[PDB]
């Protein structure tokens, strides 16, 4: 059940009541489709079917062409001053994928695999370097072409197939050339996984097969929209009658923890002479977990995806922070953990849409408003910086622009208390300090008030 | 017809005479698609023409099956330093769709729907929470299944399709297997909104049948491809032999009011020994657009779209600010407004290619020209913040980087004026204000004379 | 042969042995696709198989009213603090092709391009503004209709055609519907290229048909998923019998120039007690390539793409500097260059995967290692910024977040050296310098020791 508390005193809410998803690592499996090596087709026989044929087993060739071209490439992706991800690390999505198809282009290791998928289309692979990987065939086009369409191909007659056969050679051959078309504008390199890639029976088979535990079978099952969000599906190598690339998939090693997410908005005084007032926001803004004794945070939206109650995110653009940093949203100026703020004179009005409500930061001239469908306004905001539920609101408006608030049901508390700004003296106030901190501004003031000192 | 003014003063540039097209709402219809709820497929015939009729029957249950997987989730979607992006607040761009697909959930609603759109393929339904919507029927393939496909499906014989059939199913069915597609690699929600989800033709009926203004409609079907862009595709239920999704589309509230888009450049001293120079540059870039008796101002360049000269922007991704803002292109020094900018000591030469010609920033050792295709050079600029207009010129070279220029038609005004930057004492220069303005600055200049004027 | 370099002193690594391929200008060429005027269809036979030509007819045209909606509108499209992003220039990236566009829309130059194309499917035409383009004919479904569709499209007889003629129609109007379904959800622009709109013969074709080098030819035809990534397709006009549209190809004027990458991460002193330390950030990262006497600057990392030991790259987002800029690496205190940094308080830990290996700063309490997948930890970080090299290191943890390292072969050096940070009195140090160099660093600290001087 989501829960969500508004801190007047800080001008910030904390929606509170989810449960964590958080991908770990990677799961590396190997996705073959066996080819058929055909060049020629031997056939003078102008026949309309025929013809059909031979147009849909040139795509078929074109296809095979182009994926030899983006194999000879190796695979790469490359995966606002309120928010801290600038903070982050760089890492290299990929990099575990790329290592698997790297393993692929040495030679027997193509062989090996197809051995394993003589008999069976699910085998487990020990490669030469010694990482075993998941394998699967999804598709058998040389069974196909060299079961239903020699015939018509290796010799000059070439008995005339039916229309049947024509049409489903084309369905059949559909897949191959959408691979070949996802690959060709991605450089290689796809996400998320499309169903041409990997269908969802193929996913929640292997999903299944995955020995993960049984929490993550389940987990992974129940939001595969998500699981093909965060995956990759890399181009390796079409050698030998075999087309094959790695599927990259989600480990989540951290599950159902508790998670809140963090809303900011400026906090400015509302006197009356324009420009005379001084602005502070928490930077700290975003998604955290706990993980481990710690807390994972995630600064920037895109790292997070929320399913219901539980929040889907990525480790990878993620800060490990101390526990204490929760303290922020209690008292900021607590003495466990420096808590992250900026300062400015811009007083801009803007709206926060929470999870079960609105932060509202209206000053100067600007009409800021909450409404009901069916009532209209119920509720005019005064200058600084306030906060209303979901329950009863259907809109926000501030200024020229209308927010649609989320009708997620869930409860609401409104935390009285002096706004901070108040206890900060202009006339030494330093409001230059786009990355700053609680400490940061008092060792600031401290000394202003010391060249002061000094002078006195 | 577009304008277009360069001050050389604060290196800067505006360009006039576009016609604003703001969404300021949305409007929520709901799509529907009634479905033939089957199962078995009893038959024993082993006929090529029934294959086809079952792999194609097959792909249709495993879209309803994969459809039931999303719908079992809630839709969600997660929508520089020279711009002040920063300032925005942050909206919940489907929550209105989504509140919309809560409600289909509601049982009795989905029978609703089913009995309005019983004779007609467009109707109005009042939902049980009091909200009157659109919906409409783009495709029966209950019908069609039980109409066309029943005897070979509903019994063991099975009496063989004609091969017309089988081509005429597979084309019907493929508009569910892509807009399946689309929402599976989406996690339900897509935008833009593709002619899958909705055809030219449905779009403009359902423009047609909105009860807004006919300049509204007139505006939304001479821009389709716009709308689409600021469109939402929400997979909602899929219950009871009908799949029905929420199309969420723009509202536009503001049109036809005059808009102008400000462009910014460093301005730099040119002092010839290197790093003895500062810098100073507008922060306020972007589109504004007179709205209310206020003004709408878009800082990222993602948030307006713009055809021909009518600019399409989201209110979203704006502040509301008094119409004094632009005063800051006539005088950044007015009383009234205080002008935002950013200092540095960085002068790196760049351009900025505007509507009607280019501002170049040009310092150290940088070659910066302008050129003709035909002629070549024909203006070597100097160090310093200069522009260039379009007519005449085709492209830009600003170091080894190459600018090819916009060829729009418009008139172009050079304003001389002494650079602002030449007003401001280096010694007392702040060159640290990444968020500032022309108060700010002065403020902190004259914190410096007062320490200096202590120790004198 | 891929290298790199790790300097302790800065807290940054250099990646060398890299090869460029720069874009520095457009070729546009003029792709067209030959329509057959058609309307009525005029036919009263109900055959199933002059049902679905008369459906497929259908498509077509709603195709094509689809497209001359699009035609109506002008083109148009849109193209982190410790980044050097905000440095930028904005350039205008179809400004090339759309004027180009514009003149196709002159009378007369649609037939005279129609007229070039009569007997050949590829021409170059001198367009009325004195501007010669390559012309290419893709597809030709004017005749195909004309020549197998019309006895059953323009008589009341209507003599039933084969269901191969029914197939081989849908199989040539689909790439028509798809090009028109590309253009309805992009507004009329496309990036990247995508086989539909060029498929990779024509590509290759219009390649080796480009008077550009032969490297250059070499280079873009072995490189094709990168070119059609770096390449935009714009929709010009349907008029005539006849759809344009401008396909806008990179131009590499810079090849196998060197280039190299740089990676930073931040670098603080290591105090016991929280909050008492003083952090630093080389904020120049980025791709480097040396061109034409100076170093094209690359700050983000979208713009670049590696292939190998080759990097693609755009320089429409890049800054021209002195080569001495490559001094910071070695002396980042050197007279001749003012290297840039960034200076905080905030002592957070992560990590940047390299090109070769991991740079790692780990702070506080926070668990910093590298493994080999076999044996498992191998190296425990101590506070500080430190590096390990890809060879016999598979991953790197860094807290909560698990780093895959790149497994590229090739040498990486440590170069040892006294952190820079040490050399700071934090008594003095400006920690509030968030766009910053080396010399702005220092002026800041003289001025504070003036004040200082003055009062003692
Ligand atoms: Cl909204
Ligand atoms: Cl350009
Ligand atoms: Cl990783």
Redesign the pocket.
């Given at each position: 059940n989501i829960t969500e508390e508004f801190y007047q005193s800080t001008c910030s809410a904390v929606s509170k009541g989810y449960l964590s998803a958080l991908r770990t690592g990677?799961y590396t499996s190997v996705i073959t489709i066996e080819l058929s090596n055909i060049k020629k087709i031997k056939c003078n026989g102008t026949d309309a079917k025929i013809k059909l044929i031979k147009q849909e087993l040139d795509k078929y060739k074109n296809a095979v062409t182009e994926l030899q071209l983006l194999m000879q490439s190796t695979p790469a992706t490359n995966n606002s001053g309120r928010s801290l991800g600038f903070l982050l690390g760089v890492?290299?999505?990929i990099?575990?994928g790329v290592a698997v198809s790297k393993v692929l282009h040495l030679e027997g290791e193509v062989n090996k695999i197809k051995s394993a998928l003589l008999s069976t289309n699910k085998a487990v692979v020990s490669l030469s370097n010694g990482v075993s990987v998941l394998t699967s065939k999804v598709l058998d086009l040389k069974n196909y072409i060299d079961k239903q369409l020699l015939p018509i191909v290796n010799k000059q007659s070439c008995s005339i197939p039916n229309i049947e056969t024509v049409i489903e050679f084309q369905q059949k051959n559909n897949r191959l050339l959408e691979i070949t078309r996802e690959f060709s504008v991605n450089a290689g390199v796809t996400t998320p996984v499309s169903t041409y890639m990997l269908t969802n029976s193929e996913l929640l088979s292997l999903i299944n097969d995955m020995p993960i535990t049984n929490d993550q079978k389940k987990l992974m099952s129940n939001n595969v929209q998500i699981v093909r969000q965060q995956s990759y599906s890399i181009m390796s190598i079409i050698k030998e009658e075999v087309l094959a690339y790695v599927v990259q998939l989600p480990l989540y090693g951290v599950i159902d923890t508790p998670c809140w997410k963090l809303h900011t908005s400026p906090l400015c005084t509302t006197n009356t002479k324009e420009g005379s007032n001084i602005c502070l926001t928490r930077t700290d803004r975003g998604w955290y977990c706990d993980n481990a004794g710690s807390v994972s945070f995630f600064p920037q939206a895109e790292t997070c995806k929320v399913q219901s109650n539980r929040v889907f995110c990525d480790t990878?653009n993620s800060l490990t922070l101390p526990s204490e940093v929760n303290l922020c949203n209690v008292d900021i100026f607590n003495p466990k953990y420096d808590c992250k703020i900026m300062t400015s004179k811009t007083d801009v009005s803007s709206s926060v849409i929470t999870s079960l409500g609105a932060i509202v930061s209206c000053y100067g001239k600007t009409k800021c408003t909450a409404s009901n469908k069916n009532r209209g306004i119920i509720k005019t905001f005064s200058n600084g910086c306030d906060y209303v539920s979901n329950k009863g609101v259907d809109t926000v408006s501030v200024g020229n622009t209308l927010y649609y608030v989320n009708k997620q049901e869930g409860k609401s508390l409104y935390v009285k208390g002096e706004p901070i700004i108040n206890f900060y003296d202009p006339l030494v106030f330093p409001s230059d300090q786009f990355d700053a901190s609680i400490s940061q501004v008092n060792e600031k003031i401290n000394q202003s008030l010391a060249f002061i000192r000094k002078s006195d």
């Open positions: 990677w890492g290299s999505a990099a575990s990878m």
